[PDB]
Design a protein around this ligand. Structure first.
Ligand SMILES: [Zn+2]
Ligand SMILES: [Zn+2]
Ligand SMILES: [Zn+2]
Lengths: 387, 361, 156, 182
């Protein structure tokens, strides 16, 4: 039998490929590219007239299949959820576009946090999955994932662009093609995201905490108490337009301090795991502390994890979680496959799943008969097995 | 030529599962059922795979095994252009890859010269491949036991255990090296986000680790009518051939309408638009036009066989158009009835939409 | 001023104070306009058809063995040695090209930048790639130019 | 598309025995080596370099103004090889094009301000879009579209392009009439 397909889903939109582990991971960032449109158009929007979407998936799907991957779509169907929280559109719509445009011969749909543990051989919690927005923490038990201890933040990195557009604009020399120093704004009213990104992609990094905090002291120059150290060296970014964007070495340092500010807001990038452990059964915390899993492209941001853990550990001493939990370590389990890759692999794994797959799958027929696909959030999930 | 001849102003409606309006030059005519068909309404099949650079043909089974990639050709990670193999004589031929466009060479990343022109360039294997293979075998054994349990439960209502060691967690994550805090960053030495994503198995940070990837193969597509399952377009299997086995393009069966001159169009003002109707066949073809408001001549026009004015197999006709909108583009629709000789007399009625352009004030 | 061994075509349009270095060849329809100051062309330079070199006021020293392909437009104040400007490339007024630079076809160098040695500028986005391998010393392309330039054009 | 009569000043173009319409401003270098097959039109300031290698132009070819047709040279360590430049039938080359191809096939349309790399081979019914830069030794397969800087494969052309190309090239020459004084 032929296995299997893997879908774009967020930072993940770039994750087009097909099973097994050998597939290309074709990079689609994914947009249309419709001629009459300003390009590109991101067609990946919630709260969208579905029609608009309809026509978009139709066309994307058509496209991806059409070209991009050899697919011969009638034989392989997988939809990964990288969402649990996807609203019913568009899922309804996704199916809806199948289904009839695309005749779909049963489909199994599955979440990332389960596809996550598949690789470590671990059937237990914690999974933190961070990438395009809205970040999710979800202890997975052996077996049930447990939603009741459900947590979510931005960003992950979508907001880094405001933080960066802004800051780029708060620094400010562009050395324009006329050798003039000019304002960014106004030579440009905006910085396209691709710039922002590029700059980010290669320039942002996460500092060690003892000094991550002096970076914070720059904001807070209290009564002169600043102990924000000299920045690294400045960078001439060449900018397109035959412009040069000079960048302070100091921004590399600040952008990443969003992730980590403590306002009167909780420092949540850092909890999540902590606000959930307090929520979790005591009888399982023993596994959850200690056994942590981090997937998602944004943890490719270097030094992230350093702090991260330091922070967390740091925080474990805040009484509030301390008295509440007592302490212990944390150990990271990590695959060797890259952070982005674990969803993708656990999609490959799934071809193994063929004896099961067509069983735990939602039938085409059913759907043809009702068209109802269960949601965990519905009062009528039909027992599909009636069929 | 379709964009040079403004074929986009004259659209023909295809009646199928989806209503599609497109230029006649982009449409196919099915001689077996005598119906017009769009590219969207027909079925697309994979005929063959080929490399656009070495022009090697790949069978569909071979393309599946090789993940639809060319084994000898690579994409330059510098500009995405295909690399060429070059030889130098050493006091023996030594081969290296180079791009003619951006001047990138395999030496830029420290790759040693090869004794063979092709086949010596290999991609790094995934270090964790064996780990995935053991995990897959483990879950397959569990899936077999779980399947049997489900079959027993359904019937009632009507093997050395693979031990896998869990991944060892790391107690301490590698800290950021001190070099990143004070070292000047060279933006030319580090790979861009797009260049990193081209190698998703390990995503190199440094340009020296940015290995060339195998070139993607292209596909020759065949088109078939869904209603009668007959082929409308079939190229030959060999990618180097310009010949087609079947070419049933609509422009050879249905009279082709073109706009020659458009008058100054004004709101509610009758204006005469000059169209040309061309008979695509060697036989005499009879065409009658039926009804912005458009008024067409009520008389049947006879077009000469393919060997305002009459010249051979084309006649220039004026139609009267009265724009009904105060602003926007002036569009008119009419039905074109003509006789068809089915060599595979039928009267066919084609819905034709004309885009005349913006209304003048 | 034509140096001994330089080939200047009768169809070449030269205006102003222009010095042509030895073994330089100027193809038909080339336009060299020295309005703001003298243009100094070094030895072994090749200027092909439709090449436009203008030294204009803000309303020029060209090194040795440089190649100007068809339809190139160069306003540079200073060029180094062994540079190649591909067809329809534009080099702006304040561009400083050092030695061993390659500018790809249809690239627009409007930036106030000193291009470092061994830089290849290619693509619509004018991406600068520092060549990490010594570009093969153009001694091989200079040997062909020195033997081919005197043989394919009617030396005056 | 009412292909209007491309009325030219009758004094500016010389009509040859083979029906070629060549502007007086055209630059023909090595004319003994330049073979223009019948019904060819060569516009103003076109440069054809036949001094060192033969240039062969097919039937119904149209070369627009300031186009430079130059055969590619291959430098070997023991000498320079002169390659003839072969252009097929019904080839239409837009304005400001630089052609260094070894061979251009029949029914080929080269877009405006395009740069073709040395020793490129363009097959029959090829389309190159405006402002496209083809790297040296690029081979364009039949019914393929390349565009951009660098010029990359964007997609294939429908087979119907050949039928359209036949009528346009023949009509273009028929519409290219001497300016009959009104
Ligand atoms: Zn091969
Ligand atoms: Zn390249
Ligand atoms: Zn039918």
């Amino acid at each position: 039998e032929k296995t299997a397909v893997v879908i774009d889903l967020g930072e993940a939109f770039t994750k087009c490929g097909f099973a097994g582990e050998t597939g290309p991971r074709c990079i689609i960032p994914s947009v249309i590219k419709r001629a009459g449109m300003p390009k590109p158009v991101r067609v990946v929007q919630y709260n969208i007239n579905t029609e608009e979407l309809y026509s978009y998936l139709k066309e994307f799907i058509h496209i991806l299949y059409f070209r991009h991957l050899l697919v011969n779509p009638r034989d392989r169907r997988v939809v990964i959820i990288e969402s649990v929280l996807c609203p019913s559109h568009f899922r309804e719509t996704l199916t809806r576009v199948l289904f009839k445009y695309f005749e779909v011969p049963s489909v199994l749909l599955a979440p990332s946090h389960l596809m996550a543990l598949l690789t470590l051989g671990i059937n237990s919690a914690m999974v933190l999955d961070c990438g395009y927005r809205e970040s999710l923490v979800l202890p997975i038990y052996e077996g049930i994932p447990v939603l009741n201890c459900w947590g979510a933040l931005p960003l992950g990195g979508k907001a880094l662009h405001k933080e960066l557009e802004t800051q780029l604009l708060e620094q400010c020399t562009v050395d324009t093609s006329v050798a003039k120093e000019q304002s960014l704004p106004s030579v440009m009213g905006s910085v396209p995201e691709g710039v922002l990104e590029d700059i980010k992609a290669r320039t942002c990094f996460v500092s060690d905490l003892k000094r991550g905090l002096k970076i914070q002291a720059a904001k807070f120059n209290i009564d002169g108490n600043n102990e924000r150290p000299s920045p690294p060296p400045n960078v001439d970014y060449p900018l397109d337009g035959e412009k040069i964007l000079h960048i302070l070495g100091s921004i590399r340092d600040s952008v990443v301090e969003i992730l980590f500010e403590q306002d009167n807001e909780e420092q949540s990038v850092a909890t999540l795991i902590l606000d959930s452990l307090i929520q979790c059964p005591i009888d399982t915390r023993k596994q959850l502390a200690e056994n942590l899993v981090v997937i998602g492209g944004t943890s490719m941001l270097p030094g992230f994890l350093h702090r991260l853990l330091a922070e967390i550990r740091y925080l474990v001493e805040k009484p509030k979680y301390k008295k509440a939990l007592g302490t212990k370590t944390f150990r990271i389990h990590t695959p060797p496959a890259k952070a982005n890759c674990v969803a993708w692999l656990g999609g490959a794994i799934f071809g193994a799943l063929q004896d099961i797959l067509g069983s735990r799958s939602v039938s085409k027929e059913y759907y043809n008969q009702t068209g109802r696909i269960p949601d965990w959030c519905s009062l009528n999930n039909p027992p599909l097995e009636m069929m | 030529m379709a964009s040079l001849l403004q074929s986009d102003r004259v659209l023909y409606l295809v009646q199928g599962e989806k209503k599609v309006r497109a230029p006649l030059s982009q449409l196919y005519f099915c001689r077996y059922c005598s119906e017009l068909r769009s590219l969207e309404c027909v079925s697309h099949e994979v005929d063959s795979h080929y490399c656009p650079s070495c022009l090697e043909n790949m069978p569909s089974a071979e393309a599946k095994l090789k993940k639809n990639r060319c084994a000898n050709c690579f994409d330059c990670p510098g500009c995405m252009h295909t690399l060429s193999t070059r030889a130098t004589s050493i006091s023996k031929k030594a081969y290296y890859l180079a791009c003619g466009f951006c001047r990138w060479t395999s030496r830029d990343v420290g790759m040693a010269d090869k004794s063979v022109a092709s086949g010596g360039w290999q991609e790094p294997e995934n270090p964790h491949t064996q780990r995935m293979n053991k995990l897959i075998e483990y879950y397959q054994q569990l899936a077999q036991k779980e399947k049997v349990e489900r079959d027993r439960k359904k019937l009632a209502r009507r093997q050395k255990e693979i031990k896998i060691e869990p991944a060892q967690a790391v107690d301490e994550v590698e800290p950021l090296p001190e070099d990143y805090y004070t070292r000047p960053v060279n933006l030319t030495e580090v790979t861009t986000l797009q260049q990193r994503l081209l190698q998703p198995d390990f995503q190199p940070v440094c340009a020296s680790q940015l290995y060339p990837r195998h070139k993607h193969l292209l596909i020759k597509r065949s088109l078939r009518c869904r209603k009668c399952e007959h082929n409308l377009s079939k190229p030959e299997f060999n990618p180097t051939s310009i010949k087609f086995k079947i070419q049933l393009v609509a422009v050879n069966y249905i009279p082709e309408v073109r706009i020659m001159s458009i008058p100054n169009l004004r709101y509610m003002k009758e204006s005469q638009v000059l169209l040309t109707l061309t008979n695509p066949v060697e036989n005499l073809t009879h065409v009658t036009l039926f009804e912005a408001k458009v008024v067409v001549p009520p008389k049947e026009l006879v077009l000469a066989g393919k060997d305002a004015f009459r010249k051979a197999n084309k006649v220039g006709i004026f139609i009267k158009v009265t724009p009904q909108r105060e602003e926007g583009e002036v569009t008119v629709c009419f039905k074109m009835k003509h006789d068809f000789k089915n060599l595979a007399v039928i009267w066919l009625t084609q819905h034709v939409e004309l885009s005349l352009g913006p209304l003048l004030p | 001023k034509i140096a001994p061994g330089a080939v200047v075509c009768v169809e070449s349009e030269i205006r102003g104070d222009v010095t042509i270095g030895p073994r330089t060849v100027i193809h038909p329809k080339a336009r060299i306009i020295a309005e703001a100051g003298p243009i100094v062309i070094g030895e072994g330079n090749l200027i092909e058809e439709q090449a436009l070199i203008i030294n204009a006021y803000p309303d020029m020293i060209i090194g040795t063995n440089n190649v100007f392909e068809v339809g190139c437009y160069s306003q540079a104040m200073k060029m180094g040695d062994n540079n190649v400007i591909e067809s329809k490339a534009y080099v702006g007024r304040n561009v400083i090209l050092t030695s061993g630079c390659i500018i790809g076809a249809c690239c627009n160098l409007n930036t106030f930048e000193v291009i470092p040695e061994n830089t290849v500028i290619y693509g619509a986005d004018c991406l600068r790639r520092v060549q990490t391998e010594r570009p093969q010393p153009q001694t091989l392309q200079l040997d062909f130019l020195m033997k081919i330039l005197p043989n394919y054009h009617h030396l005056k | 598309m009412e292909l209007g009569e491309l009325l030219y000043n009758k004094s500016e173009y010389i009509e040859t025995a083979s029906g070629n319409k060549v502007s007086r401003q055209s630059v023909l270098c090595g004319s003994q080596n330049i073979v223009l097959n019948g019904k060819t039109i060569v516009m103003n300031d076109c440069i054809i370099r036949g001094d060192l290698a033969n240039v062969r132009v097919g039937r119904h070819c149209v070369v627009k103004s300031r186009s430079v047709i130059r055969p590619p040279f291959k430098k070997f360590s023991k000498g320079v090889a002169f390659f003839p430049l072969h252009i097929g039938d019904h080839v239409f080359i837009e304005e400001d094009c630089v052609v260094n191809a070894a061979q251009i096939g029949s029914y080929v349309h080269v877009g405006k301000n395009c740069v073709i790399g040395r020793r490129c081979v363009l097959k029959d019914c090829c389309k190159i879009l405006d402002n496209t830069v083809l790297p040296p030794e690029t081979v364009v397969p039949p019914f393929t579209v390349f565009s951009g800087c660098p010029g990359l494969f964007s997609g294939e052309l429908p087979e119907c392009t050949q039928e359209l190309m036949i009528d346009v090239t023949k009509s273009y020459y028929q519409k290219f009439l001497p300016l009959t004084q009104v």
